[PDB]
Design a binder for this molecule. Sequence first.
Ligand SMILES: *[C@@H]1O[C@H](CO)[C@@H](O[C@@H]2O[C@H](CO)[C@@H](O)[C@H](O)[C@H]2NC(C)=O)[C@H](O)[C@H]1NC(C)=O
Lengths: 225, 201
Amino acid sequence: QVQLVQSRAEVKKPGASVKVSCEASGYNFVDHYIHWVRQAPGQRPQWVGWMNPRGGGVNYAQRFQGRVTMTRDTSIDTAYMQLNRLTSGDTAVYYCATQVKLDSSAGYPFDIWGQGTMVTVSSASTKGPSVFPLAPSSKSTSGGTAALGCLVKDYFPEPVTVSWNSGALTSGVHTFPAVLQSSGLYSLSSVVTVPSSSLGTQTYICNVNHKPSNTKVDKKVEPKS
Amino acid sequence: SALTQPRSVSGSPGQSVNISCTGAYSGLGWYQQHPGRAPKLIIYEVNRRPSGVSDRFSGSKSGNTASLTISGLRTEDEADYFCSAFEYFGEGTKLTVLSQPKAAPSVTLFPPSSEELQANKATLVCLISDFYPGAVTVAWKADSSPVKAGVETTTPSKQSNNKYAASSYLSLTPEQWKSHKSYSCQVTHEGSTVEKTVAPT
Ligand SMILES: *[C@@H]1O[C@H](CO)[C@@H](O[C@@H]2O[C@H](CO)[C@@H](O)[C@H](O)[C@H]2NC(C)=O)[C@H](O)[C@H]1NC(C)=O
């Protein structure tokens, strides 16, 4: 089976370098150019360059010259791509690709693709979140249901688990996917919908656990003044 | 080599949709891509399928504009589609296969908490849920004037009930929060707007 298999994802500090590997199998490695294509999240693929594994020759896109390095080890059929002095603009999934099973004259386009190597370049360091209540109000309340929640703000990295009253409250809980601020840290909200008449008789705690920073926080969400 | 293709196309199950791509040497490559996966070449040399690619995908080209046609639309087809010419790629076309009734978003807006304000920060939290298709635009208003700074909006994501959810965060300083009598979160979905507003206490 003709395939390319790449190395695991990497989280790098600005200014570091990353070396992504790409092992080919099921065909003759030295016979086909290895192409590297990167794709920033939600953007268009960006061709980085190709490497001729027969003689090691390379051609890089202009905006990477002097910064990218493409090498190969023909004895184990793996190509490498090293990108230096990383910035946040280099955050992307990095693919190796090649043309093998095609009846083509060009060597473009590519029918074999690696699974991708996510490279995230961030200055964020591991940090537990600050939890803030989101209080029920008359603007939340509708038809006897009140919406309350908590704002899990500024943590890194993913994930956090949110639960309510130690998971005793599960019905009506909606935990939203987190946003990544330009700060580099994440924030998410969890909202739970409860009977408004239950308010004041019932106590609602949101439990936040951040295993990476290893914090655990409990915080209550009761009606304001 | 600047290849341009429409931003989005839509269709229902079982019908046909096509995606054009204008630019020099266009149509020499057509890629389909599902989230978290490598691009899958489906068409090459304008009209040829590689082995393993379905009959339902077809290619053609008229003048400067190659067209990718997908017949018998399945929900499997919902994906991003890229044309390519040698090293260069088009910007991409998201294809939305309409698999469920149109559902308007429900919106919830929380003001900054008192504890966040005592820490000299203010976040407004606009929660958008239960909408289909997965596409909203969020605008913020300070009283009546648009606000563009301090806004972070998530891409839509699928809930357990197959509808979509998104959220938007407006970061203010306490003084800006207190110097206006209201802030609004306006969520536009399929050309129809839903607004929610909050006020300093
Ligand atoms: C792509 O699909 C569109 C339809 O969405 C085609 O436009 C239709 O073309 C046929 C043939 O001329 C007509 O019967 C329809 O009335 C057209 N509708 C519209 C709105 O134009 C278009 O021709 C297709 N293009 C290609 C290259 O297949």
